[PDB]
Symmetry: C2
Subunit: 372 residues, 2 copies
C-alpha cells in the first residue's frame, strides 16, 4: 500500500529536505525561458499548481477531445498515486542576473559553483536557473512527474541536465532508521544531524531571521549538489585494509575505526599521529568545526559505460545548510587532498537556494521574492 502514502506539499518548508529518503530520485536542472519577471511569476505559479496536484495524487486528467494531446502521458495508467512523491524547487545564481530584476535580493552566500582541486567538471552537467529534486517510492512516479511538468512548460523551461538515482528499498522502508549503503560498499550519511530534531534543524538546515539574509529566504535552505563518479573496478581491486583506511571506518558496521558502534564519535586527541584513523581519512578530515554541520541526503546512481570504457556509477551528493559558506564550502575545503580523491571524480552539480515552503493553496513559489 506504499503507493497511497502522501507527503504534505504545503507548509513552512518544502518537503524533500527533512523528509526520510524515498527509494527513487531524479535531479533535473532547467534553463528558464521566461522573458521577464511577469513570465517568471507565471512559471512559479504554474509549478505550484502541478506539484500540488502530483504530490497529492488523484485520477489522471481525462482527454474528452482526442484531437488534443492527452492531458496525461498515461505511463501510470488511470490513477496518479502519490507514492510518497516530493518535489523540491531550488534556484541558481544565474536567476539573479539582469533578466528578472532579482539581483538585489540574491541570497548572501549564493554563488556559481567553481572547481575544487580534484574536480573534472563537465559544462554539460553544471549549474542551471532552476533545479528540481523529485523523489518518490518508484521511478515510474518520478518520471511521470517530470513529464507532466515539461508538458505544461514548453515556453518557460528547457531541460539542461538530468540524473536519476536510488537507495536500497530496505533502507528506504526503515524511514530514516537504517543508513543507505553507497556503491563503494560503505554506509552513507551515518553522522547526519537528527532531522527529526525540530530545534537542531532550525540551527543547521533552515535559514532564520538572525542571519543577514534577505527576508524572502527565511524558511528556505542553501543546497549543494555534486555529481560524483566512482572508480568502481579499481576500488573493488583495492585491499579491504586500504578501503577502511580511506573512509576511517569499519566496512561491515560503519563504526569509526577502533570503535564499536556505527554512530560512535571518535576522540582524535588520543590518536594525534593518525595510527588508528588516518589524517587523510574522509571522517577525520571532515571535522577537526562546531558550526560546519549540514544535512546530507545523497543517492547512488548507475548509468552506462564511460568514454574510457569503465562502469559509470557513483553518488548524487545533495546537502542542505542554513549557510552555504559555513557548511559545504567549508567542509569540502577541509577535504581537499583526502585519500578518497584517488577513487572519486566530481563531474557536475552546482549550488542553489531551496525556496521557503508554499504556505497554502493561496500561496505560490517565491511569492515573497517576486513581490518586494
Amino acid at each position: 500500500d506504499a503507493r497511497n502514502e502522501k507527503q504534505p506539499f504545503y507548509g513552512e518548508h518544502q518537503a524533500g529536505i527533512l523528509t526520510p529518503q524515498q527509494a527513487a530520485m531524479m535531479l533535473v536542472a532547467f534553463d528558464v525561458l521566461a522573458s521577464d519577471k511577469a513570465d517568471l511569476e507565471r512559471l512559479f505559479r504554474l509549478l505550484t499548481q502541478r506539484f500540488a496536484f502530483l504530490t497529492q495524487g488523484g485520477a489522471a486528467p481525462e482527454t474528452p477531445n482526442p484531437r488534443l494531446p492527452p492531458l496525461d502521458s498515461g505511463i501510470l495508467g488511470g490513477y496518479i498515486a502519490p507514492d510518497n512523491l516530493t518535489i523540491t524547487l531550488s534556484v541558481g545564481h544565474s536567476l539573479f542576473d539582469e533578466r528578472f530584476g532579482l539581483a538585489p535580493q540574491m541570497p548572501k552566500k549564493l554563488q556559481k559553483m567553481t572547481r575544487f582541486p580534484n574536480d573534472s567538471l563537465d559544462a554539460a552537467l553544471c549549474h542551471g536557473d532552476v533545479l528540481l529534486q523529485i523523489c518518490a517510492n518508484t521511478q515510474d512516479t518520478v518520471i511521470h512527474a517530470l513529464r507532466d511538468i515539461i508538458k505544461h512548460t514548453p515556453d518557460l523551461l528547457s531541460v539542461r541536465w538530468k540524473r536519476e538515482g536510488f537507495i536500497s528499498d530496505h533502507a528506504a522502508r526503515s524511514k530514516g532508521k537504517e543508513t543507505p549503503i553507497n556503491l563503494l560498499g560503505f554506509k552513507d550519511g551515518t553522522a547526519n544531524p537528527d532531522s527529526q530534531n525540530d530545534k537542531l534543524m532550525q540551527k543547521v538546515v533552515w535559514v532564520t531571521a538572525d542571519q543577514q539574509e534577505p527576508a524572502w529566504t527565511i524558511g528556505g535552505s542553501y543546497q549543494a549538489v555534486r555529481l560524483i563518479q566512482f572508480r568502481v573496478e579499481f576500488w573493488d581491486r583495492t585491499p579491504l585494509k586500504e578501503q577502511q583506511t580511506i573512509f576511517g571506518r569499519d566496512k561491515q558496521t560503519g563504526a569509526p575505526l577502533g570503535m564499536q558502534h556505527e554512530h560512535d564519535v571518535p576522540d582524535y586527541a588520543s590518536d594525534p599521529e593518525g595510527k588508528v584513523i588516518a589524517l587523510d581519512s574522509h571522517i577525520r578530515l571532515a571535522n577537526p568545526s562546531e558550526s560546519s554541520l549540514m544535512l546530507r541526503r545523497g543517492y547512488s546512481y548507475s548509468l552506462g559505460v564511460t568514454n574510457s570504457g569503465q562502469l559509470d556509477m557513483g553518488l548524487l551528493f545533495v546537502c542542505y545548510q542554513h549557510d552555504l559558506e559555513k557548511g559545504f564550502l567549508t567542509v569540502q575545503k577541509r577535504l581537499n587532498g583526502e585519500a578518497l580523491e584517488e577513487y572519486v571524480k566530481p563531474i557536475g552539480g552546482g549550488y542553489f537556494f531551496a525556496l521557503p515552503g508554499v504556505k497554502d493553496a493561496n500561496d505560490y513559489f517565491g511569492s515573497a521574492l517576486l513581490r518586494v
Copy 2:
C-alpha cells in the same frame, strides 16, 4: 520478503526467457579476452559457478585477510538475497571467428546486426562477444551481480556496453498476468504468446532437433536486442487520436481499434483501406501471427539527456525465437516505414544466441559447443 524468492538456475533451458519479468534489469555486453579455446572454456565454467551461487543466494564471501581486496563488493550488506535473480548468457556472431575454432559450429541464422532504414546505430552500443541479461526484483541485486562477475573475470571479460531498465511494480507483482505500460503510455507485449504452453514454446522460442542447426544449439534460442530512444516531449505534444492511429490500439485498454478487449483479434479483410486500423500502424504492419511469432520481454529505460538536449528515454527491446530469420528479421522488415518511426530511433543492441540450459552442478555453459 520478496528478496527471498528464487528462480532455478539449472534446467533444460536457461532462466530469464520464459520467466515472468522482474522489476529491474540490466543488459551488459562484453568483449571476450580469452586467448584460445581453453581460456573460453575456463570463462564459461567460471560463469556457471558465479551464476549458480548469485541466483540462489547465501552469505557474502568474507575477507579474513584485509590485505586482499574484499571478496564481495559489500553493496548488499552481509547477506546476498536471491531476489528472483536470473542471469541469461548469450553469444554474438563475433565469437565464431578465428579465435576459438568455433566457426563451423555457428548457428545457421546468426549474423552481425546491420542497420534497418530508420536506425541510427551507435557503434559503442552494438554487438559484443557475449551478452548477459541480468534481471532481479531490485536494481541493487543486479548491480551486485555485475560487480561479482567483473571481479572474477579481469583477464577474461571487458565491458563493452551496458544499459539498465525497469517495468512497473504493478505489472511486476502479477507474475506475467498484467501487461507492462511503456514510456509512450501504451501497454507493451499484449499480443505475446503464452509462455506457459510448453509445446507452443517448442514451436516459437526453443531450438529443436528438426531445424538444420548444429546439435549444440538445441534448447537454446535466438535473441534480438534493440536499444530504442523515444522522442517523448514530441510524443506528449501529439494528439491522442494520432497516438492511437500509430499503435492501432486504444491507449487505456490496449484493445485494437474498433474492438472491446485487450486481447481481441481484428478482421483486416473488412477494412482493406485501414480506416479503423491503419495499414502503417504498429499492430497491423507487424501481423498480416504464424512462424513469425516470437516472445517479447522488453523493459523501459530512462537516462540523462540526448546530444540534442532532449530527454533520453525509451525501450530496451528483447525478443527470443527459434529462428532469427523467421522471427525478428521477418517482422522488422515488415515494419519498415511504419508511422511510429517518426517517434522512435533504434541506436544499439545486436543479435545473439542464448545458450541451452545448464542441466546440473556437473554441467557448464556451452559444454556441448566446446567439445565438437
